[PDB]
Amino acid sequence: RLIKLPRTHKDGHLFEVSEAAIDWIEQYQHFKGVTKSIVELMNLISLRGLRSRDGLVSTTELIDATDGQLTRAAIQQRLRAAVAVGLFKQIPVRFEEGLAGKTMLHRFINPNQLIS
Numbered sequence: 738r739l740i741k742l743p744r745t746h747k748d749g750h751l752f753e754v755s756e757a758a759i760d761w762i763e764q765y766q767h768f769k770g771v772t773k774s775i776v777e778l779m780n781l782i783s784l785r786g787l788r789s790r791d792g793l794v795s796t797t798e799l800i801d802a803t804d805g806q807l808t809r810a811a812i813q814q815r816l817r818a819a820v821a822v823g824l825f826k827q828i829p830v831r832f833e834e835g836l837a838g839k840t841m842l843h844r845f846i847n848p849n850q851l852i853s
Contacts, residue, residue, distance in 0.1 A: 738830055738842060741791070745835045749796025749809060750816060751842040753828075754786035764848040770822040778815045779824070779845075781807070793842075816843070823851055 740751065755761075762779045765771045778799075785794050785802050796812050819825055820843075828842040 738828060740793070740830060740832045740842075742834050744791075744793070744795065744832065746832055746838045746840040747835070748798070750813070750840055751796075751830065752782050752786075752794045752825075753842060753844045754782075754789050754792045754794060755845045757847075758845040759783055761845055761848050765822075765824055765851075768822060768848075768851060770818065771824070772815075772818065774811075774815050775819050775822070775824070778807075778812065778819065 744751075758779070762776060762783065765779070766776060781799055781802060782794050785798055796809060799812055800807055800809060816825070820827065824846055825843040826846055828844060830837050830840060830842045832840075
């Protein structure tokens with residue numbers, strides 16, 4: 738998938754905005770491994786996603802929305818735990834400005850797909 742400007746890989750990992758994810762985040766909390774810090778991250782993605790202009794939210798956007806209280810290393814840690822649980826599908830990415838690197842796009846997974 739192609740990311741368009743003004744986004745670059747400097748902004749960090751990407752999350753695809755999902756209106757259905759609002760109700761999924763409450764369903765995720767029934768599953769083993771879904772901690773409150775993971776729920777905090779996904780709730781921030783949901784709130785910041787309301788003002789998204791391109792259907793995406795980046796890690797840097799999440800950091801700036803907390804005035805730096807939520808650091809990049811803290812986001813990457815909770816993200817690894819969330820991918821370990823299976824809440825996110827990792828999607829390979831390519832930017833029109835700069836290299837992709839280790840940056841990936843993350844899509845919320847339907848909870849009825851998790852129980853299987």
